[PDB]
């Protein structure tokens, strides 16, 4: 019990408000920013997930396959 820290994964700080959940994690409404552009999202947006990064629906399209992936098995 008792309050302390149990929410965000980037900063590891509880989140009172909404949390950006992508796949199986949770982050703050500011901590998690599209790696491509880095524009905050809403409290329930839909985007493509890869490994552990947040890729926008329009952004990803561009960063689909650009010198990314050393080993392709």
Site track 22-61 with Zn ion (rule: CB under 5 A), x = hit: ------x--x--x-xx------------------x--x--
Residue 8 binds to Zn ion (criterion: CB under 5 A)? yes
Q: How far is CA 53 from the centre of its chain?
A: 5
Q: Which two tokens stand for residue 33?
A: 């920013």
Return phi, psi of residue 27, to 5°.
-140, 170
How far is it, in rounded angstroms, from Cα 57 to Cα 67?
20
Nearer to Zn ion, 39 or 71 (CB): 39
How many residues form the binding site for Zn ion (CB under 5 A)?
9
Annotated binding site for Zn(2+): 8, 11, 28, 31, 34, 37, 56, 59
């Amino acid at each position: 019990g008792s309050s302390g820290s149990s929410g965000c994964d980037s900063c590891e700080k509880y989140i009172t408000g909404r949390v950006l959940e992508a796949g199986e994690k949770h982050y703050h409404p500011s901590c998690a920013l599209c790696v491509r552009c880095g524009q905050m999202f809403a409290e329930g947006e839909e985007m493509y997930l890869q490994g552990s990064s947040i890729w926008h629906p329009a952004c990803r399209q561009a960063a689909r396959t650009e010198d990314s992936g050393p080993s392709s098995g």
